[PDB]
Each structure stands twice: as C-alpha cells, then as structure tokens.
C-alpha cells in the first residue's frame, strides 16, 4: 500500500465514540491515519541511512523488505515487511556504515481497526558508533500474529519479545522460549490488547460507587 495507514475511523464531531450528546453533530467522518510514506529526500542522516540500506540490500530485496519509510517529527520509522525482518536487522547491525549495534527493545501496539495489520512491533535501534537512531515497525494480522524473532541478531529482544507476546499475543517464532514474563503463565488473555477490558472495580463511596474509567464515558 501507499496511502497513509488508517488505524481508526471516528464518526461524529467532538471525538465521541457513542451516538452523540447533542443531535446533528454525529455525521462527520474523519479517518485517523498514521503518516504514510515520506517523499524521498529524507532529512538529516535518514537519507544516508536509507541509501546505505538500499545499497547493501538488493534493489529487489530492498523493495521486498521495506514496506514504508516515515520521517515523522524528525524520527525515522522503517515499516519493514514481516518475514524479512531478520535479514534487514542483520544488515543494519552488521554493516559498517549502518552498524546499529544497540537494539533498545520491542514495543507492542494494537490497532484493532487496522485490517490485516492489527498488531505492530516497534524496534528502536541506536547506532552508538554513528550516533544515529531509527525504528523498525513490523505489522502482523490479529489472525496470524506471528513475527520473526530477532533473538539471533539482537539478544536483547528477549524479554521484549516475551513481554510483547504476554501483553499482545504476538508470537515471535524462533524465540528460544516465548513464555509469559509479566503475567502468570496461567493467565488468560493478553492485557494490553485494546479488546482486553481494563479489569478494574468500582470505587466505593458512601451511598455510591464510580465504575472504572473504561466503563464510563470518554471523548477520545
């Protein structure tokens, strides 16, 4: 794809998920789109980093692996295609010009409205040698939440792949042991998924109680 990545479609003015407190304002339809591919002249060293990545990777392989490049707020995010993640990770880590020796972790985020790409894993990579920073974004469907584990390339991803599996169910296949790290192994569900309820209890008060914030109204 080439259009910006719509993650949610909000209907109605005032950011109201429900029908609307006032009649007549619920007809606005605004898709919430995360930024799409950036025009080629990336700012700063991002342009050099992508030039080197496209040089080390073959043109065919580069096209197959890099789904998108997003330069947002002077930060570079390579939407990498799944499956190819280990290859590009190895290239980034090992290549002298890229040399992103320090992978800082793996963060899971869930986009239940993003069809075919509900689960995203974010790999913040830093190159101390060149003092550079990038992020890799890998998308997996909710129905097939598998992603190639970067354990061979970045051992630090262990306990980050485990944590993101625990909180989102992303199956980092190839991981030495993808067991729950935060939740009990007996736990049911993956808490940080949006569909997973907050699980709070009403706050008690003399003569009343306040339900958890997830049950009550909101205007996100």
């Amino acid at each position: 794809g080439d259009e910006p990545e719509i993650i949610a479609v909000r209907r109605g003015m005032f950011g109201n998920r429900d029908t609307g407190d006032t009649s007549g304002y619920g007809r606005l339809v605004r898709p919430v789109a995360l930024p799409g591919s950036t025009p080629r002249p990336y700012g700063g060293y991002f342009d050099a980093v992508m030039d080197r990545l496209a040089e080390v990777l073959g043109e065919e392989r580069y096209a197959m692996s890099i789904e998108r490049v997003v330069v947002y707020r002077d930060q570079l995010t390579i939407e990498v295609s799944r499956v190819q993640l280990p290859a590009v990770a190895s290239v980034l880590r090992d290549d002298p010009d890229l040399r992103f020796e320090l992978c800082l972790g793996v963060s899971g985020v869930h986009y239940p409205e993003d069809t075919g790409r509900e689960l995203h894993a974010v790999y913040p990579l830093m190159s101390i040698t060149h003092n550079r920073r990038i992020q890799l974004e890998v998308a997996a469907p909710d129905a097939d939440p598998h992603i190639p584990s970067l354990y061979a390339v970045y051992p630090t991803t262990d306990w980050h792949e485990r944590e993101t599996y625990d909180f989102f169910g992303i199956i980092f296949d190839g991981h030495p042991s993808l067991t729950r790290i935060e939740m009990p192994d007996d736990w049911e569900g993956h808490p940080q998924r949006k569909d997973y309820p907050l699980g709070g209890i009403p706050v008690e008060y003399h003569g009343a109680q306040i339900p958890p914030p997830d049950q009550r109204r909101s205007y996100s």
Binding site: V203, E204, H206, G207
Partner: protein, 108 residues
C-alpha cells in the same frame, strides 16, 4: 472529580434554592466525598477547581483500621467556620451576586 486520575472524588450538585442556599450561584456541592484510599495526592483536583473551593492543606495525619472511615465526606472536608461566618444555609451577602463572590468583593 473530573480531573482526578484515581477517581478519588465523588461529587453531586444540587440547586441553591432560595429557601436553602449553600453557595453563590445556582449550584452547590450537595454530596462531596474523597476516597483517601484512592487519592494519590497528585493535586490535579485543586488545579481543576474553578472557584478555589478545594485547596490542599499541609495537614497529613490520616489513618484508620476501617476502609469505609477513610471515605471522607463533605462534613469532614469543610473548613471550620471562622469568625464572621454564618451557617451555610443563608442568603447571599446583601447587594452582592455570584460575580461579586468570584471577584472577591465580599466581606463578613
């Protein structure tokens, strides 16, 4: 209560009927409870309050053996009645209105 991140405040408003007025304007806080077992002392409540009705004193001693006893109602939270103050159920100051109270033009 809106701004409290811990839902530690429960407030319910009621009309300031002329027969029984507790605050200037047409609304007052009839029921006001702070669940101090949920309060985190963040202070967002006092930042939120548009009337300076809610402040945070330097008093801190608080503890009890019962969960319920730490749900402090309006009676415990209200500041003590000082000299020159009358009982809340009374009409506004003569020749004054809500705007005068908020502008600070009211005296005992």
């Amino acid at each position: 209560a809106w701004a409290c991140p811990a839902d530690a405040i429960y407030v319910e408003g009621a009309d300031n009927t002329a027969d029984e007025r507790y605050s200037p304007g047409e609304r007052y806080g009839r029921v006001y409870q702070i669940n101090y077992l949920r309060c985190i002392g963040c202070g967002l409540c006092i930042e939120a309050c548009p009337t300076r009705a809610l402040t945070m004193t330097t008093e801190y001693e608080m503890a009890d053996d019962n969960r319920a006893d730490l749900i402090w109602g309006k009676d415990k939270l209200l500041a003590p009645l000082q000299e020159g103050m009358q009982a809340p159920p009374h009409d506004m100051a003569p020749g004054k209105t809500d705007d005068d109270y908020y502008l600070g033009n009211v005296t005992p």
